[PDB]
Scaffold this active site. Sequence first.
Site, short mmCIF file in Angstrom:
data_model
loop_
_atom_site.label_atom_id
_atom_site.label_comp_id
_atom_site.label_asym_id
_atom_site.label_seq_id
_atom_site.Cartn_x
_atom_site.Cartn_y
_atom_site.Cartn_z
N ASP A 166 47.60 35.33 34.82
CA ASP A 166 46.88 34.27 35.56
C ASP A 166 45.38 34.58 35.76
OD1 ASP A 166 46.90 31.65 36.64
OD2 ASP A 166 46.98 32.41 38.68
N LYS A 200 42.42 33.77 35.59
CA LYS A 200 41.30 32.85 35.74
C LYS A 200 40.23 33.34 36.69
CE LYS A 200 44.15 29.92 38.75
NZ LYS A 200 44.83 28.60 38.76
N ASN A 216 40.64 34.00 40.41
CA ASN A 216 41.46 35.13 40.88
C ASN A 216 40.68 36.43 40.89
OD1 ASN A 216 43.69 33.84 41.71
ND2 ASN A 216 44.70 33.78 39.67
N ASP A 232 45.88 38.04 42.93
CA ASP A 232 47.04 37.22 42.57
C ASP A 232 47.82 37.72 41.35
OD1 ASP A 232 49.04 35.42 42.50
OD2 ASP A 232 47.78 33.63 42.47
N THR A 252 55.66 51.69 28.96
CA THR A 252 54.24 51.57 28.67
C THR A 252 54.07 51.42 27.17
OG1 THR A 252 53.99 53.97 28.51
CG2 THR A 252 53.57 52.95 30.68
C1 LIG Z 1 43.23 34.97 44.69
O1 LIG Z 1 43.95 34.27 45.65
C2 LIG Z 1 44.90 34.87 46.45
O2 LIG Z 1 45.23 36.04 46.25
C3 LIG Z 1 45.40 34.14 47.67
C4 LIG Z 1 46.59 34.65 48.41
C5 LIG Z 1 46.40 35.82 49.33
O3 LIG Z 1 45.73 35.68 50.35
O4 LIG Z 1 47.12 36.98 49.17
C6 LIG Z 1 47.12 37.92 50.18
#
Ligand SMILES: COC(=O)CCC(=O)OC
Length: 290
Positions: A120, A122, A125, A142, A158
């Site tokens: 994920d 992006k 993140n 994330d 691995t």
């Molecule tokens: C990148 O966005 C997230 O990681 C949001 C969720 C979060 O607060 O995790 C602790």
Amino acid sequence: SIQFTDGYEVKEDISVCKRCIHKATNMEFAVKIIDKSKRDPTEEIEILLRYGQHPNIITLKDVYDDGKYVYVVTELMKGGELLDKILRQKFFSEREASAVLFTITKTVEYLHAQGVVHRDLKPSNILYVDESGNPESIRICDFGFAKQLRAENGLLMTPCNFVAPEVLERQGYDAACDIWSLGVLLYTMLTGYTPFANGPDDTPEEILARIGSGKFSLSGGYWNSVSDTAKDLVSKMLHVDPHQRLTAALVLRHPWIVHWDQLPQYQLNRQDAPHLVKGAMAATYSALNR
Ligand SMILES: COC(=O)CCC(=O)OC
Ligand SMILES: COC(=O)CCC(=O)OC
Ligand code: NA
């Protein structure tokens, strides 16, 4: 025994993510609250436990499970999304872009070598933990979609027993997709616009038609001020064929990363429309996941 409510006070929304206060210190943290009937976050928690001590991976602080929800407490990112900060800096340069991509790619190289694909990756993140603007403050966040390579018997593996061949090639595909998103990040850092979408209103079909054609502009306009070494790296990170796209290890050997100290330190010439970019990026990743 001790519950999350006991050691933490829950605050506003930021799966569901909230801000919270650790009662014994009054320090603030983030908690991701995960509905066990929706999904099993065992993978995500195992990855964060094993790998969150990496300086540039979001650090796990506490975890609780009440039988309904899992509570994953982590450091609270106070510096916002990386791209949001970088697109609003007028004086940003390729030398700074290279330090940022280095820090991020070195983290991805470590993950892939440990058998972890993010899946994920992006720009939204990838965040700054504080306002220092320092590459050391970057965090990849994330891991809810990440996957550890395993053998049939359950044994963590691995890439360097028996793993099914289609688990391996899919892992290979996933790791390449990770690098492609770092390519999208780089392209956007250099020019202020994203490679496959102009704004939040681009249709999914036209974004995918652009992605699938393997073509994107590296010349003219905002690109006139940008070095060949940068364009070369970008082209090799965004290559549509995952078999030809660079790995994280090869990104780190490209002269744009290695020879950063020869990069121009004068300002990039970029679009300044960070909010348009944010919608173009959302459109791009919506199109991808469908
Ligand atoms: C990148 O966005 C997230 O990681 C949001 C969720 C979060 O607060 O995790 C602790
Ligand atoms: C399935 O998604 C991916 O493979 C992401 C990367 C990619 O689309 O490259 C063209
Ligand atoms: Na960490």
